[PDB]
Amino acid sequence: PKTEGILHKGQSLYEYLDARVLTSKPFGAAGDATTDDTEVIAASLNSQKAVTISDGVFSSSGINSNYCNLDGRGSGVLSHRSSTGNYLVFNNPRTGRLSNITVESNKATDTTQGQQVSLAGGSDVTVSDVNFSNVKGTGFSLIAYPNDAPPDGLMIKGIRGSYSGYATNKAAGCVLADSSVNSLIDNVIAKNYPQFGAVELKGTASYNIVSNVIGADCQHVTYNGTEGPIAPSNNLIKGVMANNPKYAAVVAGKGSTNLISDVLVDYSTSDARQAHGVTVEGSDNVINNVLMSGCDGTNSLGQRQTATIARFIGTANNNYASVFPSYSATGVITFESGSTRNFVEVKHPGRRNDLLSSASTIDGAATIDGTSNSNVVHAPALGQYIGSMSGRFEWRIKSMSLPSGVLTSADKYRMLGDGAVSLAVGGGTSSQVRLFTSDGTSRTVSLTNGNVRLSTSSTGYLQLGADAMTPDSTGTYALGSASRAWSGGFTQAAFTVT
Amino acid sequence: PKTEGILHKGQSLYEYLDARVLTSKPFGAAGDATTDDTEVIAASLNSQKAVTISDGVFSSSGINSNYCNLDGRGSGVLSHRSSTGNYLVFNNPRTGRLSNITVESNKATDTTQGQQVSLAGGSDVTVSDVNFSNVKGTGFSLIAYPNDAPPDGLMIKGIRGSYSGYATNKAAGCVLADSSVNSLIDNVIAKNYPQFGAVELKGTASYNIVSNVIGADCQHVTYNGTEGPIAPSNNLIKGVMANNPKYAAVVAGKGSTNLISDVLVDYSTSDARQAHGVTVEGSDNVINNVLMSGCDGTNSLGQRQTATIARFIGTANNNYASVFPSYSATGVITFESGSTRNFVEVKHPGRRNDLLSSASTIDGAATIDGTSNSNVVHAPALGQYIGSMSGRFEWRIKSMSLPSGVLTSADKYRMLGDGAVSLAVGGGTSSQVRLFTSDGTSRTVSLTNGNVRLSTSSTGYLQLGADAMTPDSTGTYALGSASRAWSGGFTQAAFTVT
Amino acid sequence: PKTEGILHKGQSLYEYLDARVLTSKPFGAAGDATTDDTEVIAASLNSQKAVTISDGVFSSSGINSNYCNLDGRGSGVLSHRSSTGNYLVFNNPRTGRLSNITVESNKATDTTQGQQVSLAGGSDVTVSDVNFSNVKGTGFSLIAYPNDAPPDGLMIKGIRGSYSGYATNKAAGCVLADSSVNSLIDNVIAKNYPQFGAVELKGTASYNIVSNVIGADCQHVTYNGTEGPIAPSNNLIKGVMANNPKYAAVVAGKGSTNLISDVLVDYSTSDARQAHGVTVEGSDNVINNVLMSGCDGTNSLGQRQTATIARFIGTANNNYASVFPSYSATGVITFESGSTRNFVEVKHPGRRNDLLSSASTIDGAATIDGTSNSNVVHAPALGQYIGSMSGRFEWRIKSMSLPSGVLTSADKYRMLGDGAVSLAVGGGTSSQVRLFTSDGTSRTVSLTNGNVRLSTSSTGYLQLGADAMTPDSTGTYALGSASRAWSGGFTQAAFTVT
Ligand SMILES: [Br-]
Ligand SMILES: [Br-]
Ligand SMILES: [Br-]
Ligand SMILES: [Br-]
Ligand SMILES: [Br-]
Ligand SMILES: [Br-]
Ligand SMILES: [Br-]
Ligand SMILES: [Br-]
Ligand SMILES: [Br-]
Ligand SMILES: [Br-]
Ligand SMILES: [Br-]
Ligand SMILES: [Br-]
């Protein structure tokens, strides 16, 4: 007997088995890692049904589909049967789901080009809990790009990728969202990827959120790149863990108004020669809470390793960074010569007591020039404020008006209030204001042994005692000169000639 | 032959199939977008088994159940057959799962009332990877509310919503958690929703986390509201992407002790007439890292557009905001007349060089009054500190005690230490302290041409030279007056009469 | 007729059913909560196929497996049949998925030891949407540990746990990652757990991300512990919701360079006697945005309750914390006496106007000593800066050199620039510099009634009028003394002897 000739609940048993019951794999697929399953799999993927490909290793060549709804139940492995070229390509899927499956490459060489999964255009596709294995050569594990509309509303979550054949600057990465909008990329763990790291945003990518990204032994962990006039802008990148990258945790790129937040990077076992926290080339980006450690001046191979927690590249401008250089290597900030209006808050200085004691702590210090183009560095724990983009520091107790034409650009420090305003200095055993100039000349108004003293020279003073004003030494200091004489004066008893 | 008359593994094949085997849709369901599938689907959802509704479009009217365990395998669509009213209503589910499915509405008009999915009470329900389509009128895509115990332990994640028929203030949103506790809302992408935006927390909602929310062209992206005396409090809202909202990225509401963190908002393509970053009406809230851009004084239609990155509404008090007004429009902060004790840190000033040069930068500046009720604004990159809630600025190098009965409210600036304490001013070519008053009177203690000068008038001075104290001009300045004469003095040689 | 004698598409119907057709539970499993299903379930889990255990309660004793691929479809409950010992133990799974299922304990006593689910070694295992029920005694709901290699690449997400039999310090928790690397723990809701709370990282745990954790009525919510010489380090912990813990929201532990961010804690209904925000014992950790409320000096039972938003334990050093003590209890920061170089920014002071008015606000205040080991506390809204690790506060308008051998350690306040540098004080009715010392002696340089006055005693002064310098009173003050006389002087008219 055959199923076509049997009834179940009054209907064809064949049809029930073929169309209604859920199966572990498509009928006719072997899943034995050797039989060519391409045709059966391609047919299933091009249907409008949910496809299950599980409980086996399915050898299959390149496949194009207009539909993406595939689940591996955590046991399906799609193993690329070809040693070159792209594997799975989804063309402009309108909604879709690719989930709970492993995609394995079998590239011929370490320079073989090919993407593992491509969303060639797409809207509202969710790729979730996918493991990319045996990743090699040039290309990406998961890439979304315009075809020709921007990818929109993607959710890429729970992605693992494992790369091999690392080389500096090699053109590969784990996840690439090229020019996507309104998309989420969350919970990614990428190992040993080169130039484009764990997550790359590219081109006109905007209004995406990238979150919870771990990159281990990658060149960069997150990377913002472009081949066009506009770079990734208006993206949120939050929660980046950089386990021993080779160059930087985060490359913020040439774009603008990105918010990057909570970046932890360790270099303790890395072969990096030029270790970076975050770099930025564009404008008006926020880089909040970069915690970097494990840079002691030497890398894992005994080579010199420089440290830079934040680098402002080229004309980078109007950016903000808050940083924690929790390491002993000298380098902390690099302001390239053309960079302007960047503000860095060193929220904890590590073991440093002064960010200016070494000229190498802040490379590019000449760009801190007190003009409207100034870069600025603060280290509040050290009470250290270096530069102001207003050309001054000013405090006021309350909103108030100032008298016209009194304060000038010379008034670089302003302590303002209404009513009585007193600046109190002291609390100890002696208290003073020291006025001084670049030539080393110094003069004080001091409270010394309980009297005011006013400096008359490098060593001399007038002392305002309770009963008399006196010079520091006798018979040497005059009141007036022949060229600058008093009009006169008033004394109850004539001055005593000593 | 029939399956009742065939054996499989020790029982009839009929019973094996009927009792054990999983299917793509319930028996009797058409999934053809036209047949009324309400009866079969209602029966399934009212069972205690895990229900699968996939590979079709299932036309169905309103359904109620006390059980919620439904999976659509990414291919099932529940298509509301009625033109009005609520669709799916789950009454007090004790645990539940709604996953991998699309819920489509089919409302008669753009003002038709109806919720798509209601959790009318519930505990430990997970709603994940659900797409809400053709959303219109008033109501919500997904709403949880007390029935009448608080919803508790919900996990709502991976939600898409697409609204049409936007109108200002229309009473609709994507996800609403009314009075829930201990719940997670994560990874939401909502398009074109009106008043209640992508995620609303409402009423006594507390102890929830809302994370990774993208709202595109919504009126507001996240919204905290209430129809009672108590508003959402003690919630964490983190990672908000506001792609061109029409009024505000985040409405923090009238509640208290919410922590809102990492908010990116762009207005570059918005028709908003009044663009806002975050608004807050309540107390003791924290609003961290609001990055706002795309406001140059006009909207997408060429109409005037105001900007306000943080707005403190009504009696809003004791709030904190850290903000990045990366835009050229003049408005930045609004303190409404009853607002008190709000502290704003402008972490990067955009292109501004002075927060006080435009009277528009801080609207409500009179509320910065230096009292215990003062609002306060700092812009550290500009070295600019506006207001203090203590009525003073005070520094100390270490913990110390001060002598009783010395400092008073006049001492609005205090630079304190033990032992020797010196305030050094200068490092250039001239250095001074300028004392001045509101009437324009200015007097200096300066280091000028290498000597101390003490101002005796607007233009006059005493010069403390190394060998003599001299007046600025000869024969015009006296030592003593008829009514205030010295007691006497001591001079080695009698004064010379010139 | 048996299915072995029937054909479906040219293959045995028996084999097609048994191998390819999915079922709700393993053949032979009762799922009736009473029948011992151990044998059948153990066999299934030890196969290399994806296992489905759903639509029932499956009574089962302890099981060991080398494979982990199990899905409960939201309706399966694994109910531990034994009253002691471990339940499910997965031994070094290489990849794995445990999902959509409930695991229930049935321990004999409130001190019975046992783990619910153990990953005894493991790589690339994902545990998702699991509910742990009836959790009791000592041990954990989900534990991962080395066997013998660190767990690597775990994804633990969407976890609920409910503990019963809470007691202070009892050795139990929800999720424990012991010595894992490169792992993600996201979206956890844990109720009533004791010592180890919702999520513990332990031992050499490094390069993990923990996010979106809700703990209700737990002793601690997140906990970093160790039984060895090295403690959890280089981890990111972000988004912690502490709904009324009994001791602390976050225990940061003895390790280093962890970044903890966005912690919301409420004590309003807690019986805690000692309420804490975050504690830390190690070094170079960052604790960002701790918002704490609900501490008024008493607990929920009316007993005394202390408050500490940040506690620096033992030799804790070089840590940073930004905090919001939004409560009325007096305690805010505790620096234990051996703690050094910790910097706290109180970003909003709540209702406090002065962090020093109560000695209880900063416990351990002697550790703010102005040395290179100093702790430091800032409260910017109050304009209050307490301590500096450099021993000074210094501002400069731009990068510049200083001539050496001019400024010394006494110059504890430095206001620097090039060219003309003026410190302007005033804007009101009178303006002054008050120099003062610890004995209460005070002297001023003031602008008073439009003239400079220089104090000569507690009450006396010299007044620099436009036409004459005069003493405050007549016939009492001398110019010079017998031992300190002028050289001479120059006057156009002889001084008038009155
Ligand atoms: Br680039
Ligand atoms: Br270096
Ligand atoms: Br180091
Ligand atoms: Br140093
Ligand atoms: Br004032
Ligand atoms: Br049989
Ligand atoms: Br409201
Ligand atoms: Br603009
Ligand atoms: Br001192
Ligand atoms: Br000057
Ligand atoms: Br410990
Ligand atoms: Br200058």
Side-chain angles (χ1 to χ4, degrees):
Chain A
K2 296 182 80 55
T3 55
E4 200 185 319
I6 294 165
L7 292 182
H8 178 54
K9 295 175 173 189
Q11 293 161 238
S12 171
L13 176 60
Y14 178 106
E15 185 167 6
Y16 169 83
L17 297 173
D18 190 68
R20 181 75 90 262
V21 307
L22 298 184
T23 55
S24 57
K25 61 174 177 172
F27 187 98
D32 61 9
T34 63
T35 306
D36 188 356
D37 287 330
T38 308
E39 63 308 305
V40 169
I41 291 174
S44 295
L45 288 182
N46 276 279
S47 76
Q48 290 169 20
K49 290 184 185 186
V51 186
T52 297
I53 300 181
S54 71
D55 285 356
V57 176
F58 298 79
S59 183
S60 38
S61 305
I63 297 169
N64 290 291
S65 179
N66 299 308
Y67 299 105
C68 183
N69 189 349
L70 170 57
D71 180 61
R73 303 169 61 228
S75 60
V77 177
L78 292 173
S79 174
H80 199 193
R81 184 177 186 85
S82 179
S83 58
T84 71
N86 296 335
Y87 189 8
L88 302 177
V89 179
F90 300 92
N91 173 346
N92 283 115
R94 194 141 194 168
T95 82
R97 169 163 194 93
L98 174 63
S99 63
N100 310 321
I101 202 161
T102 295
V103 179
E104 205 111 31
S105 275
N106 288 290
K107 286 178 171 184
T109 80
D110 283 318
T111 58
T112 298
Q113 169 70 32
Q115 327 294 358
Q116 295 186 289
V117 173
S118 304
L119 307 175
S123 63
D124 297 348
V125 179
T126 293
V127 182
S128 65
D129 295 303
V130 178
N131 297 316
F132 293 99
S133 56
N134 212 31
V135 195
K136 296 178 191 181
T138 57
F140 293 88
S141 294
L142 176 65
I143 178 177
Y145 55 90
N147 196 24
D148 287 324
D152 195 348
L154 309 183
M155 294 175 172
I156 294 169
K157 317 165 189 165
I159 305 301
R160 292 190 186 89
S162 170
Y163 189 85
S164 74
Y166 177 98
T168 309
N169 298 336
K170 200 169 168 180
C174 185
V175 178
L176 167 58
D178 182 350
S179 305
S180 68
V181 295
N182 310 128
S183 299
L184 296 167
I185 302 176
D186 191 27
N187 287 147
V188 175
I189 310 177
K191 287 174 175 156
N192 212 211
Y193 285 85
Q195 167 95 161
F196 302 108
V199 177
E200 174 177 23
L201 300 176
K202 188 171 180 184
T204 55
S206 34
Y207 318 120
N208 309 104
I209 301 177
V210 176
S211 64
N212 288 352
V213 177
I214 302 180
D217 310 300
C218 293
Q219 189 174 342
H220 312 290
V221 181
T222 68
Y223 189 95
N224 287 343
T226 193
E227 295 165 2
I230 295 318
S233 299
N234 289 130
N235 301 289
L236 171 66
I237 298 167
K238 64 176 221 171
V240 180
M241 167 62 65
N243 173 1
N244 290 274
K246 280 83 160 58
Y247 190 82
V250 171
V251 173
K254 294 186 181 194
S256 52
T257 64
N258 300 289
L259 181 44
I260 296 163
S261 186
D262 292 338
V263 179
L264 194 160
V265 57
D266 175 40
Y267 281 97
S268 68
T269 59
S270 171
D271 67 7
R273 302 163 227 115
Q274 288 110 46
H276 290 80
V278 182
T279 73
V280 62
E281 195 168 2
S283 74
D284 301 283
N285 300 285
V286 170
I287 303 159
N288 200 240
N289 290 162
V290 183
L291 172 42
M292 177 161 153
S293 67
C295 298
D296 71 2
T298 301
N299 72 188
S300 59
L301 300 177
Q303 306 173 292
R304 177 161 191 185
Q305 175 188 82
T306 60
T308 303
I309 194 163
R311 173 181 289 272
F312 300 87
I313 300 168
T315 57
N317 60 274
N318 291 281
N319 305 285
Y320 170 84
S322 59
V323 304
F324 301 87
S326 298
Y327 57 75
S328 64
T330 303
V332 177
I333 302 164
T334 294
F335 292 124
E336 294 189 12
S337 71
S339 68
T340 61
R341 291 187 67 87
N342 305 108
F343 175 39
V344 178
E345 185 164 358
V346 177
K347 292 199 227 195
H348 192 102
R351 307 301 179 275
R352 303 165 186 82
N353 297 321
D354 183 343
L355 301 185
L356 297 175
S357 50
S358 173
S360 299
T361 301
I362 302 170
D363 188 350
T367 66
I368 303 173
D369 67 3
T371 71
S372 62
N373 292 132
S374 198
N375 292 319
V376 172
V377 180
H378 288 193
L382 303 180
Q384 186 164 48
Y385 303 96
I386 313 164
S388 170
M389 299 179 196
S390 72
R392 64 179 185 268
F393 288 88
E394 68 160 57
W395 293 265
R396 71 187 66 203
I397 303 310
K398 64 189 240 179
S399 293
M400 54 180 293
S401 55
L402 290 163
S404 185
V406 176
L407 270 22
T408 72
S409 66
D411 296 285
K412 285 154 183 175
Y413 295 92
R414 304 169 184 197
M415 288 179 158
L416 309 172
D418 248 357
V421 180
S422 180
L423 162 61
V425 176
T429 50
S430 65
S431 305
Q432 70 178 27
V433 173
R434 176 183 223 145
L435 300 176
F436 79 105
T437 49
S438 58
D439 66 2
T441 302
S442 179
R443 298 286 184 273
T444 54
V445 176
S446 66
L447 174 54
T448 300
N449 304 332
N451 303 303
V452 171
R453 290 184 178 181
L454 307 170
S455 295
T456 57
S457 70
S458 63
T459 57
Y461 56 78
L462 292 175
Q463 176 177 300
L464 284 53
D467 52 334
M469 177 170 73
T470 51
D472 60 285
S473 75
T474 204
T476 59
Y477 201 76
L479 300 185
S481 67
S483 179
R484 292 294 185 274
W486 313 111
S487 56
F490 291 80
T491 182
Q492 200 285 330
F495 283 14
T496 299
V497 176
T498 49
Chain B
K2 294 193 175 184
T3 55
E4 284 91 348
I6 297 163
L7 293 166
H8 184 73
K9 298 178 77 64
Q11 69 180 323
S12 76
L13 175 55
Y14 174 92
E15 286 305 334
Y16 183 92
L17 292 177
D18 203 51
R20 299 180 189 279
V21 163
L22 304 182
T23 59
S24 65
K25 62 184 179 181
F27 185 64
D32 63 9
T34 73
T35 302
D36 185 356
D37 280 333
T38 309
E39 269 269 12
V40 172
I41 292 182
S44 290
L45 294 180
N46 275 262
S47 79
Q48 295 67 53
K49 291 179 178 181
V51 176
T52 298
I53 300 176
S54 70
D55 293 346
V57 179
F58 299 82
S59 181
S60 41
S61 310
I63 296 166
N64 70 72
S65 183
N66 293 294
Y67 304 93
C68 181
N69 187 345
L70 172 58
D71 176 27
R73 300 175 61 237
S75 67
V77 180
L78 292 178
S79 178
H80 200 196
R81 190 184 179 82
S82 314
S83 67
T84 189
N86 299 334
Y87 191 6
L88 303 176
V89 179
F90 299 97
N91 286 302
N92 288 119
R94 188 94 147 205
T95 79
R97 167 112 176 155
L98 176 62
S99 65
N100 310 324
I101 198 154
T102 297
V103 179
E104 181 175 358
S105 180
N106 286 293
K107 285 180 172 177
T109 80
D110 282 321
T111 58
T112 297
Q113 170 69 38
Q115 323 310 345
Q116 298 185 283
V117 173
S118 301
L119 303 179
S123 60
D124 292 353
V125 177
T126 293
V127 179
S128 60
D129 292 312
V130 180
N131 302 311
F132 292 97
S133 58
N134 208 34
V135 193
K136 297 177 188 180
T138 59
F140 297 83
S141 293
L142 176 61
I143 176 181
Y145 55 89
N147 190 30
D148 347 74
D152 191 350
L154 309 183
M155 289 176 175
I156 292 165
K157 52 201 180 156
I159 304 303
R160 293 194 186 84
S162 183
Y163 189 86
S164 71
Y166 177 97
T168 313
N169 299 328
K170 199 194 300 195
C174 187
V175 174
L176 163 59
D178 182 344
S179 303
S180 62
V181 297
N182 310 130
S183 294
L184 298 169
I185 301 173
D186 190 27
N187 290 145
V188 177
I189 308 179
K191 293 176 171 161
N192 309 124
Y193 285 83
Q195 175 82 143
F196 303 107
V199 176
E200 174 176 26
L201 297 179
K202 190 178 185 175
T204 57
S206 298
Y207 317 122
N208 306 108
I209 301 181
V210 175
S211 189
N212 285 355
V213 179
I214 303 180
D217 310 295
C218 298
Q219 189 173 342
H220 314 287
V221 182
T222 69
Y223 192 94
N224 287 343
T226 187
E227 292 169 11
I230 295 179
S233 299
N234 284 135
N235 300 288
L236 171 60
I237 296 159
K238 58 174 226 178
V240 177
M241 168 62 63
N243 171 3
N244 290 275
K246 280 85 153 50
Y247 189 84
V250 172
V251 174
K254 308 178 168 183
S256 52
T257 64
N258 300 290
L259 180 46
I260 296 160
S261 182
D262 293 337
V263 178
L264 191 160
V265 55
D266 175 42
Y267 279 96
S268 68
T269 65
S270 175
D271 62 10
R273 295 286 279 294
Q274 296 168 325
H276 298 79
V278 181
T279 78
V280 57
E281 193 162 5
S283 65
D284 299 300
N285 299 286
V286 170
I287 301 149
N288 200 241
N289 293 161
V290 185
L291 174 32
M292 178 167 151
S293 70
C295 302
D296 69 0
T298 67
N299 71 186
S300 62
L301 305 176
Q303 300 165 338
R304 301 205 74 263
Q305 176 190 83
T306 60
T308 302
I309 194 161
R311 178 174 181 172
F312 300 87
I313 299 172
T315 57
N317 61 277
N318 290 283
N319 301 287
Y320 171 88
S322 57
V323 302
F324 298 88
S326 303
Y327 58 76
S328 66
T330 64
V332 180
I333 302 158
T334 296
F335 293 125
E336 300 194 350
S337 80
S339 67
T340 63
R341 295 193 81 192
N342 307 109
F343 174 41
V344 171
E345 292 200 281
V346 178
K347 298 268 75 265
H348 192 100
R351 304 300 177 278
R352 301 167 188 81
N353 297 323
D354 180 348
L355 292 197
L356 297 177
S357 57
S358 171
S360 293
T361 305
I362 302 168
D363 187 7
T367 65
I368 304 172
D369 66 6
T371 72
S372 59
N373 292 136
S374 195
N375 292 318
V376 172
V377 180
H378 290 191
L382 300 182
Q384 187 164 28
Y385 304 95
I386 313 163
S388 168
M389 299 176 201
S390 70
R392 63 183 183 262
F393 287 89
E394 65 162 57
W395 292 264
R396 67 187 69 204
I397 306 308
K398 59 181 225 65
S399 287
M400 53 183 302
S401 314
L402 295 165
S404 193
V406 180
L407 272 22
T408 72
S409 63
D411 298 283
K412 284 159 181 168
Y413 297 93
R414 301 175 188 193
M415 289 177 150
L416 308 169
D418 285 342
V421 178
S422 179
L423 163 57
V425 176
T429 53
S430 66
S431 308
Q432 67 180 24
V433 177
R434 182 208 300 267
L435 300 176
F436 77 104
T437 50
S438 60
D439 69 357
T441 304
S442 182
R443 295 291 185 270
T444 51
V445 174
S446 68
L447 176 51
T448 299
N449 302 330
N451 304 297
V452 172
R453 292 185 179 176
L454 311 172
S455 290
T456 56
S457 70
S458 54
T459 62
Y461 55 80
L462 291 167
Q463 180 166 305
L464 281 47
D467 57 357
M469 177 169 80
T470 51
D472 60 279
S473 70
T474 200
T476 60
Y477 199 79
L479 302 186
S481 71
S483 70
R484 297 290 188 277
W486 315 112
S487 57
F490 293 80
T491 182
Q492 188 157 294
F495 281 18
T496 302
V497 176
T498 63
Chain C
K2 292 177 165 58
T3 52
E4 66 199 2
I6 299 161
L7 292 180
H8 179 66
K9 297 185 177 203
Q11 60 184 7
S12 154
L13 177 57
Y14 174 89
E15 302 289 359
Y16 175 87
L17 292 167
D18 202 65
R20 313 187 96 162
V21 174
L22 304 183
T23 60
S24 60
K25 62 177 181 183
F27 185 78
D32 57 12
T34 61
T35 295
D36 188 347
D37 285 330
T38 311
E39 258 258 72
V40 167
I41 291 169
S44 288
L45 295 178
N46 275 276
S47 76
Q48 302 183 16
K49 291 191 193 175
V51 180
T52 300
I53 303 182
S54 69
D55 288 356
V57 177
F58 297 82
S59 182
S60 36
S61 301
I63 295 170
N64 281 284
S65 186
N66 38 339
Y67 299 104
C68 183
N69 191 345
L70 173 61
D71 172 15
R73 304 170 63 233
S75 59
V77 179
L78 292 171
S79 178
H80 198 195
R81 188 179 181 84
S82 313
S83 66
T84 188
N86 300 330
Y87 189 6
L88 301 172
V89 178
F90 295 100
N91 295 292
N92 287 109
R94 193 151 261 26
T95 78
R97 154 181 120 158
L98 170 62
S99 65
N100 310 322
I101 200 160
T102 297
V103 179
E104 176 170 29
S105 284
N106 290 290
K107 285 178 176 184
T109 81
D110 277 319
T111 58
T112 295
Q113 169 71 32
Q115 320 310 351
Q116 296 187 288
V117 170
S118 301
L119 308 176
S123 59
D124 295 353
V125 180
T126 294
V127 179
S128 58
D129 296 308
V130 177
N131 303 310
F132 293 99
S133 60
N134 208 36
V135 191
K136 298 180 187 189
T138 57
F140 294 84
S141 291
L142 176 59
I143 183 178
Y145 56 89
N147 189 25
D148 59 290
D152 192 354
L154 309 182
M155 289 177 175
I156 292 165
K157 58 193 175 173
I159 305 301
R160 293 186 185 91
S162 265
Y163 188 86
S164 82
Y166 176 98
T168 311
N169 299 332
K170 185 149 51 158
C174 188
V175 176
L176 166 56
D178 181 352
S179 303
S180 65
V181 294
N182 310 129
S183 296
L184 298 166
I185 302 177
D186 189 28
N187 289 151
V188 171
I189 306 175
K191 294 177 174 161
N192 303 113
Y193 287 83
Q195 174 84 171
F196 301 112
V199 176
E200 174 178 26
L201 298 182
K202 189 177 187 183
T204 57
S206 45
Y207 318 119
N208 310 105
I209 301 184
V210 175
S211 60
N212 284 358
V213 177
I214 304 179
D217 308 300
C218 295
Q219 186 169 344
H220 312 289
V221 181
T222 70
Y223 191 98
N224 286 342
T226 192
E227 291 170 13
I230 292 168
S233 297
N234 289 129
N235 301 287
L236 170 62
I237 299 167
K238 67 176 316 191
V240 178
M241 168 62 64
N243 171 0
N244 291 274
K246 284 95 158 44
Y247 189 82
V250 172
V251 176
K254 297 174 180 177
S256 52
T257 64
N258 301 286
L259 177 50
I260 294 155
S261 185
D262 291 339
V263 178
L264 192 158
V265 305
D266 174 42
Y267 280 95
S268 67
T269 66
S270 175
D271 66 5
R273 299 290 312 278
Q274 299 192 16
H276 294 79
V278 182
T279 74
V280 59
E281 189 159 8
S283 72
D284 301 292
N285 300 285
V286 171
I287 303 157
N288 165 244
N289 291 161
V290 184
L291 172 46
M292 177 164 154
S293 65
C295 297
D296 69 14
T298 63
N299 72 181
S300 58
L301 304 174
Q303 296 168 289
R304 291 183 173 92
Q305 179 187 81
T306 60
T308 303
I309 195 161
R311 179 176 183 163
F312 300 85
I313 297 169
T315 51
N317 60 276
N318 289 282
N319 300 290
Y320 171 88
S322 54
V323 301
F324 301 86
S326 192
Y327 57 76
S328 58
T330 58
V332 178
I333 302 311
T334 292
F335 294 124
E336 298 194 0
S337 60
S339 68
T340 58
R341 290 189 68 87
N342 304 111
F343 173 42
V344 181
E345 288 197 283
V346 175
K347 286 166 160 181
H348 192 104
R351 306 300 178 279
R352 304 168 185 80
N353 295 325
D354 187 345
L355 294 193
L356 298 175
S357 55
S358 172
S360 302
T361 308
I362 303 173
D363 195 13
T367 68
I368 303 173
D369 68 4
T371 70
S372 61
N373 295 127
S374 195
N375 295 319
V376 170
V377 177
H378 288 191
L382 303 182
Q384 185 165 49
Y385 303 98
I386 308 163
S388 168
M389 298 175 199
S390 71
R392 68 178 182 264
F393 289 85
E394 64 163 53
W395 292 264
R396 66 189 69 206
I397 304 308
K398 61 187 239 179
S399 287
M400 55 181 40
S401 84
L402 293 171
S404 67
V406 178
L407 303 189
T408 71
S409 64
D411 298 282
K412 286 156 182 176
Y413 297 92
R414 302 177 186 191
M415 291 175 165
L416 314 171
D418 308 43
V421 178
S422 176
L423 165 56
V425 177
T429 52
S430 61
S431 306
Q432 71 181 21
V433 174
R434 183 203 299 278
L435 301 177
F436 78 103
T437 45
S438 68
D439 62 354
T441 300
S442 182
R443 297 289 184 272
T444 52
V445 177
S446 69
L447 173 53
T448 299
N449 298 328
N451 303 299
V452 174
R453 292 179 176 179
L454 313 168
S455 294
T456 56
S457 71
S458 63
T459 57
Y461 54 80
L462 298 167
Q463 181 169 294
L464 298 187
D467 299 317
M469 173 175 84
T470 50
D472 59 283
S473 72
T474 199
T476 64
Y477 200 77
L479 298 191
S481 71
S483 63
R484 290 296 182 274
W486 313 111
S487 58
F490 296 83
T491 184
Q492 188 158 313
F495 280 16
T496 301
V497 172
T498 59

